[PDB]
Amino acid sequence: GMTPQSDTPKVTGLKLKRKSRQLEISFDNGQQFTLSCELLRVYSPSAEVHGHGNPVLVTHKKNVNINAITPVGNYAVKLVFDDGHDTGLYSWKVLYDLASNQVDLWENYLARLRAAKASREPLIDMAVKYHT
Template structure:
């Protein structure tokens, strides 16, 4: 995923739906998405999750019921998401959020595959 895209779409509205654990994002190019808190948590751009280089990623498990407790603006280029499991590192740049929105389906399938390969099963939430 690229994080330095020139002229990438920028969010014009970000709303947290805590009951459904979804973050709604509307971009200035009319792209709209609903990203689950779990998805945002397991794809955190932090070094704790991504590691310090290719192949050093840390699989996040047991994040099905995580929520976002705060959304903090960082300049005009990013937000910091504070999760209910205490995770609060990693800046979600506009480019990164747009990449997550555009690639949601393939990234989610990739994550489920990694969980399965590691022998983990997601608990179903209603």
């Protein structure tokens, strides 16, 4: 159906935790979350589509990290990857859309991986939940 008006909140905090390969976000509305650096790079806002499409089917990474944050257009950030990818872009919508679905859309990779015969690089996490 018709698209939204991009009335998303605007990010007013960004923090890292290389300890556990994660990144933290705050908005100016009284919300925060944390996302996996693995998820960030697989679930790019485009990859090898056409500019603006869904991303490709990707494997885990090994021990990705962030090396800098640099804003763009006052409304998005570059999140330069020490794994060797200093060129990507993150609009505020995208990061919330990941965060609010960071479970179902993660389960996606573990499933499609095996149906796809792709790789499985070293990826540990420690924040697992088991409800519903």
